[PDB]
Design a protein around this nucleic acid. Structure first.
Ligand SMILES: Nc1ncnc2c1ncn2[C@@H]1O[C@H](CSCC[C@H](N)C(=O)O)[C@@H](O)[C@H]1O
Ligand SMILES: Nc1ncnc2c1ncn2[C@@H]1O[C@H](CSCC[C@H](N)C(=O)O)[C@@H](O)[C@H]1O
Ligand code: NA
Ligand code: NA
Lengths: 283, 371, 283, 371
RNA sequence: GGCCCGGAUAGCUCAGUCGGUAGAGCAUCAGACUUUUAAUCUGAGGGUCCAGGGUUCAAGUCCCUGUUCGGGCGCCA
RNA sequence: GGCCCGGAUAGCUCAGUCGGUAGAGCAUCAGACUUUUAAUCUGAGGGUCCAGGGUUCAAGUCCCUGUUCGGGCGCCA
């Protein structure tokens, strides 16, 4: 930690990410006297973690070992406790650039959900920016506040428990960017406009279904939004393997040599959602 | 036409397929169940079914307040007011299933507070588990190619069904052709070619090992008439051919097959020697490059050939090598991506994008050599 | 020719396909006394084409040369005169297999358009099948009839000039398969059902827009169609090139060797249309 | 905030972008036209414009019978009742353009018989050609990355904008970091990193040849404050560093730059020697494998690195080599496919699927070495 | 006489009979260098496809005409 | 005493600290072969993920419990 600044050494209260081999991993809250069990053995925090530098090989128990990684939003996204379906880093990367997020940006978000996007945004807009996020589910809202304090990023984020479609984001004409991940985003387009600065800003909505996109685009146009774009981004991941196809027996007694290939981990890439962007300008 | 005993058949539940031959008093499994197929007869293909007591019964072909948000929906874990033990009783009691659903709904405190869509989704999830409906359909390349890619993709070198379709088209497979095929895809490609040739023309199958695999081919339920034009010839005697240097009671039955097989192989070698084939289809676990460079010699000019490979790199070499050899034109290295869609009112979107594991194709036309 | 049977030698009336290098090509109707100009010179049919075998190298004029290919639907699709946008072989391949087309199949189609799909179907269902196609544009309908006679496939196809959405396909309960390529296919679903055999058959509709698909699926369900599936197939074509990335200069005085790559011809693959399939069964 | 002279800026018409710096009385071209930018000032970014006499004028931000079928629509070629000569007159006369459209419509016999959608489409086609509207927007990584991929993709090794976005995220680019970058993408990657670092931290740019390219970087319009943390160091002296073996009136100005550059290079080499960098970003026309194997040594443990390559094969080798060397974890070879959509009432569908020419990424985290 | 075929994007000018058109050269500029009204080497900046019309589904790998560059046929269409 | 962690698809049984779970073995069957209540080699057939519930958007890389196999900690949660 922190999530917003690299530190050399592991300390109490830190969220650490353990790599367990393959690509499997688990997140851990470091506390004195605490123990964590893994397939490679046990980790006693007070002696095996605390005081030690990130990126180190940590021997666990019966000679087993693990690597400990410094937390990042990307790693957090892959290890956080789901209270909702979340966005993954591929969609988040595109959202972040297309919303023109940077240090100092003021951002409004709903719904907070499980905080995957929230942490990414905070990482990007720190140290001078602020995130005003909204979640109308009391428990999810509070669980998010807890995590933000645990991760020491409360300064850069305010969670408001309310319905974004009736009561808005809780701020007006302060935001450079608005991000929506809710079932009925067309009912929030007006508040997004109100939340964005008068001088203008950027808008993005995430929707799984094309009918949600259609309604969103209709509402954006009617309210005065411009530069409407709807995109979908699809990740493909490859395994690096050496393969050798056996030569055929034609009866004969070079052109059949082994090769490196990049094969997809999965035969199919799924659909998360459509991303609809737009711009607010005066006039 | 209609279903009958001895008929090769395909069973379908949701998107899951399994092929079987119908037999009186025979036990087969399908997605965690046991059937007796006897009862499914005289019924038209497309008919539906349900299990009961080990036997299938013909069922019909066919058969409101809600919330707006989940803002106050909590995961207590105490929403379903019946137990994991109570639940077995209903099945152990052998009740329909639709009622088990209705019961689960009625005993869900949250159901009424859920959105209409969330409700529809809750039901669909339950029906899928308790309302097991089996359809019986007719074998076809469509169904068998989709079945294999889902059930045994390794047996067909991960050739996706859209890729198979391209091969049939790019190779202009049609009635009357003299086709050459070299397949280790369980006979699926062979069968697909046979469907599109309709018993007209001839197919010469080059096989490795001791014989050609035709497990899939058998699922098609082809007439005997389609066999007259079907030939086979061992792949290990190909080099000889392109050089012309090619030659207590069952022991007799073994002598019959071995000589009747010898015969059929000599015919096949004659047909190949004519070097006038109308196309070449290759889809195997073997490296394609040497197969092509050899087998094309059997193909006539102005004829299409198509080579499948699960991997791209081998087809890059084959492309370059064909370019040295000459005798080909309009070389095309291709791949197809396939996307399927959920189309429902207010709930429309893509599901899966199949790519990279459907395979690659190298295609072109033969031409005359320079001399 | 023919389109339905391979012949060794070129003859008058044949449609021949000339390959002009690269992937470029042109279709030609072979007639005595006729001439065809290409970038590689001139072809005099009576002596340079007629009597000669397909697949041959044909010297043209100033030592230039060309290859002559036997016609196929796939080659025709790439060289035919557009009177409409047409379907290409990738969509046609999928349509053909999923409709379960084979020799002996009886097929209904609308709209005929420029005949790209028509020729593919005829090739597939010959010699025993028949195509009943429909086109409500008089000129396109007649131009299609002309081509079918020129290509000697009239036996296997009947073109009817009428509105498929009011008057249907012109046949009833005879078809194993129905294919639609029109702007308002949901208005033809009833006639498709009527056109298909009572024992059942297969249905496919091609639509560029998702709203057309939605209406089509709604109509299919209402009329009693089953096994509804909506698919999209996207072709990717690769150029085979050898590339070599120059080693960087780190100041030092093997791991930088040239390689074969398959690169896409285009940086983007376009959208043609969605393909919606379904099945008709009694009950 | 608002537009001003000297400001770096981006012009947009439809989806086409071009970057330029504003100057009083300066001529620039954009999609077949000539501008004088003087008139575009005091206006807010997002403002629109039209050409007139070589000068741009501020325009507003904003500004029915039909047929069912084309069954009786014929391509006579005689539908538009005005000539290819008449048409120039309207322009040679310098009329608005909207009227040229209205005129073309009025003189189209078929327009009224066309479908509403066909009509909307006819108009859009005409407006696009006669109603040239130019928007002036603020530079950003979004806009500049999209511009470059469309206008000069070769300059950035065909790195698509979604791919650039992934690199920024996978590399956890943020304020405070000490970042190392090696780029031959005209300074676009450098600039994107600089936008996300907001002047906090440091960037060390390794360059080939006689200096680093920063043409794109300049389009961003960064404050001078962002330069204090920006360092550069020649790539040809890297090996020396990892071994410690590293050392009439303008002739003076040349001596000043050469020594002030020597200085800045010594600082940079010091920072690198600390071997405590928070990340590594590589995107070049050079083979990546040796770059990585060398440059990682400057990176601290538990830090992300990302390598771009227009081609996959080179990243396969680099993957294997990193696996021999060790010191890395969670290696990931990735690619992103991008699809854009047309979203209109009753006319919704995908347009283009960008794939294969957007590039590939190899990413992972550093770890401590075994000893 | 005409007919047929192929081209036109960067300030200018080009681009392959493998299904080779976001690939270059010239020029310009910068760096280095020496030979300095400047040369040389290296590198960099510069790209959305000639114009007009018609037309396909609500997706152009569509068509016609004009300008201009080029190839071919022969007084025939 | 308990707690923590990881598994469960083919008739049976397994599967890697590289982001190694549609990959196999056993057995069975076929072919070839010789040594024949049969051996040997080669090949083939066989796959949709244990059960139940809850829950996320109208997309699960989500959660709980049960059964069972395994790893670890120690009388602490
Ligand atoms: N009208 C509304 N106002 C506030 N929150 C809402 C809302 N409608 C839905 N939500 C909330 O929006 C969330 C969508 S899940 C979003 C997950 C988030 N993008 C992530 O990456 O973590 C849910 O938690 C839901 O409670
Ligand atoms: N209601 C209708 N009845 C008959 N034809 C119709 C029709 N509506 C549209 N069409 C015709 O359908 C055609 C669609 S273009 C179809 C092209 C065809 N698939 C091919 O590959 O060649 C048009 O020619 C149009 O005239
Ligand atoms: Na030019
Ligand atoms: Na098992």
């Amino acid at each position: 930690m922190s999530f917003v600044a690299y530190e050399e050494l592991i300390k109490e209260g830190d969220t650490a990410i353990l790599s367990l081999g393959h690509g499997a991993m688990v997140a851990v809250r470091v506390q004195r006297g605490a123990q964590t069990q893994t397939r490679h053995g046990v980790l006693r925090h007070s002696v095996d973690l605390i005081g030690r530098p990130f990126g180190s090989k940590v021997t666990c128990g019966r000679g087993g070992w693990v690597y400990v990684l410094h937390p990042t939003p990307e790693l957090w996204t892959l290890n956080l406790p789901h209270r909702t379906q979340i966005l993954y880093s591929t969609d988040i990367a595109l959202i972040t650039m297309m919303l023109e997020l940077r240090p100092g940006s003021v951002v409004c978000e709903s719904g907070t959900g499980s905080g995957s996007v929230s942490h990414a945004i905070i990482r990007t807009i720190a140290p001078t920016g602020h995130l005003h996020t909204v979640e109308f589910h009391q428990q999810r809202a509070e669980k998010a506040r807890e995590e933000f304090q645990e991760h020491r990023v409360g300064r850069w984020v305010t969670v408001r428990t309310q319905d974004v479609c009736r009561s808005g984001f809780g701020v007006s004409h302060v935001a450079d960017a608005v991000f929506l991940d809710i079932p009925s985003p067309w009912e929030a387009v007006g508040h997004a406009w109100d939340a964005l600065k008068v001088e203008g800003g950027r808008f993005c909505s995430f929707s799984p279904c094309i009918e949600q996109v259609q309604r969103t685009c209709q509402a954006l146009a009617a309210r005065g939004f411009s530069e409407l774009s709807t995109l979908e981004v699809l990740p493909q991941v490859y395994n690096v393997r050496t393969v050798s196809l056996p030569p055929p027996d034609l009866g004969t007694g070079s052109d059949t040599s082994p090769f490196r290939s990049g094969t997809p981990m999965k035969e199919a890439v799924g659909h998360t959602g459509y991303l609809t962007f737009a711009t607010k300008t005066p006039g | 036409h209609r279903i009958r005993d001895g008929d090769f058949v395909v069973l379908k539940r949701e998107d899951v397929f399994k092929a079987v031959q119908v037999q009186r008093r025979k036990k087969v499994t399908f997605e965690k169940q046991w059937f007796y197929l006897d009862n499914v007869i005289g019924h038209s293909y497309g008919t539906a079914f349900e299990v009961t007591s080990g036997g299938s019964l013909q069922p019909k072909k066919k058969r409101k307040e809600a919330g707006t948000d989940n803002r106050n929906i909590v995961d207590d874990g105490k929403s379903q007011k019946l137990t994991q033990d109570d639940i077995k009783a209903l099945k152990d009691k052998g009740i329909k299933g639709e009622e088990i659903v209705q019961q689960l709904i009625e005993n869900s405190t949250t159901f009424r507070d859920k959105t209409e869509f969330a409700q529809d989704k809750y039901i669909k999830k339950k029906k899928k588990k308790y309302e097991a409906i089996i359809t019986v359909v007719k074998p076809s390349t469509r169904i068998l190619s989709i079945m294999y890619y889902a059930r045994e993709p390794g047996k067909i070198n991960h050739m996706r069904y859209d890729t198979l379709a391209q091969m049939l088209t790019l190779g202009n497979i049609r009635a009357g052709n003299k086709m050459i095929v070299m397949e280790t895809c369980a006979g699926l490609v062979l069968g697909a070619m046979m469907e599109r040739m309709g018993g007209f023309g001839s197919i010469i199958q080059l096989y490795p090992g001791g014989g050609p695999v035709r497990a899939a081919t058998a699922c098609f339920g082809f007439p005997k008439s389609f066999l007259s034009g079907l030939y086979e010839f061992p792949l290990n005697k190909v080099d000889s051919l392109l050089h012309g240097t090619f030659s207590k009671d069952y022991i007799q039955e073994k002598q019959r097959r071995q000589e009747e097989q010898r015969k059929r192989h000599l015919e096949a070698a004659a047909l190949l020697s004519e070097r006038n084939a109308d196309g070449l289809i290759v889809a195997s676990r073997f490296h394609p490059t040497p197969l092509l460079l050899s087998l094309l010699d059997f193909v006539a000019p102005s004829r299409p050939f198509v080579v499948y490979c699960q991997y791209k790199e081998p087809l890059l070499e084959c492309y370059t090598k064909l370019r040295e050899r000459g005798g080909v034109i309009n070389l095309r290295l291709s791949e197809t991506w396939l996307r399927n869609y959920q189309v429902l009112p207010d709930r429309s979107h893509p599901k899966l994008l199949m790519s990279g594991g459907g395979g690659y194709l190298l295609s072109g036309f033969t031409v005359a050599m320079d001399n």
